[PDB]
Amino acid sequence: SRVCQVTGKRPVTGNNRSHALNATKRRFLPNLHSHRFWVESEKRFVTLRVSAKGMRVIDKKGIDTVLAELRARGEKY
């Protein structure tokens, strides 16, 4: 599913609103990208499906912290 592995960002619903305020249901998808992260500890690339926001979280926290969080949730890589 379209779920960010780091943040848990997923499709959320909302409305398109026209100029005449017609509400039609829509979705807002996360900006997801499969990205190979270098993990120097494991000496390995780990592919994560990550939102762009999740990539900034990895930049800030470091991949090892984030992967440790994924292991505690039981979310797989």
Binding site: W38, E40, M55, R56, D59, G62
Partner: protein, 41 residues
């Protein structure tokens, strides 16, 4: 992305000096190759 260099990278700086790079440059090249570290401490 503020990084700290672990070698002399070309058109960046020598060992030890800390440079602001584009995050993609750090993420996808400098850090995997062992040319920079994220400015952590």
């Amino acid at each position: 992305m503020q990084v700290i260099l672990l070698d002399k990278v070309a058109n960046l700086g020598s060992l030890g000096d800390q440079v602001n790079v584009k995050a993609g440059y750090a993420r996808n090249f400098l850090v995997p190759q062992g040319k920079a570290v994220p400015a952590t401490k």
